[PDB]
């Protein structure tokens, strides 16, 4: 509309109803000029770390992380009272846009409004550009609504052929100025709507039964098994007798079963105590990338983390593996620390009922056919893929964790649940791209066909609001005794948690899963 | 609408009619940035003074004090002609908003308009945030319409557990950016309406009878009482005789009565003459907080001031207590003075008809059952709570005093009249919150996920208008002789009162109650 | 319910202490009484209480 | 808390008697009536609308 | 109970001669008499409690 | 405060162990318990205060 | 029963009633080996908070 | 229930189920009970063996 009229309002709220919750979040953003208005091809040839791609002058909005849309109290209402969750629908607004001229004259910077400058915005609803929003990376909104965030720069990667970065003829370049975009001055605003495709609810419960205990403890099976090949307690001794017996109540390892535990790929285990670890360097011929379970694409080594869903150690246990996601608190400085106390460990231990341990094995298997002259031999199953009859449980969603991922576009996929957690989506929420339109500087008065390299220095600010409709399943259970709940157990604190401190800093000192309530198999 | 169009007009008026008066007040406000756009948790552990809470970047409007809405002549019309008062309805406008960029370059500050900046406003009509407006504190509009005032900063307190400030798990944090808010540029304006819940009229009259004199002076009672247990004028002497007599006209202390005076909690009495006071230090083991009547919550000592309604000394008397509210004139400098002449003392003496004195007692009580060998003993009743049959009178409203208070949200309360005076309201007039929206400064051209700490320096100005509909009861009385009125008795003055002085300063040199007219019990 | 103790007297003259009708120590002084504005008022009958 | 219901950042416009004497000790010093405004940070001395 | 007793402190009690109303009290009004008053006028004041 | 202090009289304070209700008090009722009573019958009497 | 649902703008998490009992030989709120059902805790109703 | 490790001791995730907590039909000698059920669609079992 006009310069003196606001194009939007601040809406941050959560509306609860039975079966539904609607969250809305508004933030203030600042967008700089990226790459000095240029596309730049980027890459380095570094063994397994070899990459190539392009960085763009554009930037984009990602709300993909849960604490963007929920307060700690709203997250508590959700996970204590509900078995399930899934987004129905979304809409995004960008408004109250302000473009700033910045000038340096005497060595100090002054800022003024440039009222006729535009910002460009388009949402890619057709997914024609590489989708980077699901990669588990920084640039999402801050969890605290008063914080102002910088819009992250957009870039993508190509095909890496071997361990060299050099492109081949299959590599694609994407110019974003090649997409129709809405141009906005200070009176203009942007809006888009989105509908989530139907997806299974996340399970916000933990099992109150074990996969192998599903039977009736009071009853025998009508099935029979071989109890022993000899009399006595000792191997390779006694008289040889085939002793068959009914499977009685009380020996539950020998019960026949309809179902098996899920798939496993063993993971290397590490101790939070420095003295209990073998000494493995960070880089070298023998490095920690070598010893972690890893996959190989096209010669390159990729850490398998978190990997297929598996039970893992508790968050307070000494041991941990790459199956656990790790978050940091404020205390570390410099992107490195020697203390695990500064870090937020995640535990999948809840799924120990239906899932094999990450650091142990799926089971043990008979290698050979024994006979009178051949002793039985067993081997470990460290990695076992899926066989008919397995049932498993997906990784939990976290308050600091990703909401969704984009299912890769390929002609096959299996159980498309994202391994870092959340909702696999063939058509995820679109990426909304934004850049500052270049404003040339004072030109030369003689025509030159060279492109304009000289530009006014600018940046823009504004507000962005995101609304999501969530569908929730209310817990209904006949359990008599009380459930586990998520509570404040923190006790007496100098500075209370989940609030700003003396200096005005807002930190998240815990990692909160969704699984508290229980449900029987 | 637009930058060159005013979004409101100046309305300051009072419209009088029989049964109704409507006041309207317009002021100019200035809003700075508070806490440098941050929430800050605040507290100190100081014995009884221990507190904790948060200060917010937000600020709020409070008109809660009477002289905001009335001129001294309008207050005179009200209290001379009317027995009663109470607000019907309210509406508030905020308009003509101006956001200013301030820049420092050579060591001097320049100010410019920032036309695209917004200010955020919301009224909390649902009372979900702690209500601080009733606390009897500074930040209300100035009484003189030409004065420009600063908008007060908002903050609240938590639960204090013991004498230590450390929070427990019951403490709540409130983010105001979590409430939907209207965003306003210079063309935009804000408006809200409010209806007062029905509340008893304030009594603008003083009683022309005494609670104990309500009888007919010409007549005897038909009741009888014990006059004496002995002959003669002396105690423990004479002949023992039970002497019964009718209660005759002329001895009115012995009349039987239907009603009792109100409740009392004795208060310590101080003299305005320094030589007539015992020497009590301000702080120490023995301090003045120790000697004043006080209450104890959770170990902490709170001054009981003003306390339950009680008659007190005249405003010109030598003695005073904490039952009296004290206001200051301009003369003191530095928030301290040794002279009572600089202070405006308030007197409840008008209620001496139905209320016990603040510094004396409720009465005296018999301790024991006397007999022939036991002499009668009496003790003072310093504090007596309410018994069936008491009738009392509330504290008076003052021209400098608070209009309303919020009744605490609790499952019991008794006679919810605010002890500092005014109208107890379950749903009081809402708090209207305002802050300047942050405008980031020139950012870095490389993405960082840290929050933006760098901001343009700004402030905003504008006008706020408040309209209140008041319902008034006109005095109707058959009193023959003239009433006491509120008049200008000041005489010949170098600088007349209730007007600006030579230097342009507007001060209030008197404290004006509402009780002049009289009414019989 | 609420209580304000009241002084007790005997209908038997010999069982009462000797209290004069008027004086410095009078019966108005010994009866439970209230004070408005300095004046003493007999609290009679007073708040409801069981009696003899 | 009932006694903390106020705004911690603001002073009252009310005034009270701070002390009857100079110094830290009882029954000592010079006799002076010292009045002061009720400042932020001393919350025991705030005037209040409600009682426990 | 006047005090908090302990191993070295004996418990002490005092009489409650006058006690006002607390939440949870229930009482009974004075009886009407054939020679007694029928009604009274409730005083005109901005508070009264149990106007019997 | 028990007494009115003066230049020759030191201030004296006493404890309030029992204090009934005065105008302006606000309180909070006892909590209900999972093992506790749901209701009670208000006694049939011609007065009661805060019948919780 | 009629219930009021909590609606509050409190940002940080509430205190909740949870099973904190830990690892138990015989779990609480269930029958024991001998078939006896006991209540080993007393549970109030006040967990959530509200401002004055 | 859930078995945690090789020890039987329950944790806070274990559930107890009282069946007297479900509405049930009570039957004397003249009464009878009936219920109907529909199978969800499921693939046929293969009652054949492969000839290739
Ligand atoms: N996150 C996610 N996205 C998409 N598809 C998924 C996901 N997780 C599982 N699946 C697939 C595989 C499951 O067997 C099936 C469940 O469908 P239903 O009948 O709805 O339970 O859907
Ligand atoms: N200030 C204030 N706010 C709310 N309630 C109050 C107040 N003062 C007294 N009351 C209550 C207690 C009184 O007995 C009653 C009078 O109601 P009526 O019939 O209207 O005279 O209302």
Numbering used by the authors:
A (entry chain B), B (entry chain A): 222 to 742
C (entry chain G): 483 to 534
D (entry chain I): 431 to 482
E (entry chain G), F (entry chain I): 587 to 638
G (entry chain I): 691 to 742
H (entry chain J): 379 to 430
The article reads:
They are assembled from 60 viral proteins (VPs): VP1 (≈82 kDa), VP2 (≈73 kDa), and VP3 (≈61 kDa) in an approximate 1:1:10 ratio.
For AAV11 and AAV12, the closest related AAV serotype is AAV4 based on VP1 or VP3 amino acid sequence ranging from 78 to 81% aa sequence identity. Surprisingly, the structural identity between AAV11 and AAV12 is 98%, which is only surpassed by AAV1 and AAV6 with 99% sequence and structural identity. Most notably is the 5 aa insertion in VR-V for both AAV11 and AAV12, relative to AAV2, but also to AAV7 and AAV13. Similar to previous observations, a structural comparison of empty to the full capsids for the individual AAV serotypes showed them to be largely identical with overall Cα RMSDs ranging from ≈0.2 to 0.3 Å. However, a major difference is the observation of weakly ordered density in the interior of the capsid maps in the full structures interpreted as the packaged genome. In the AAV serotype structures determined in this study, the histidine side chain preferred the “left” orientation in full capsids.
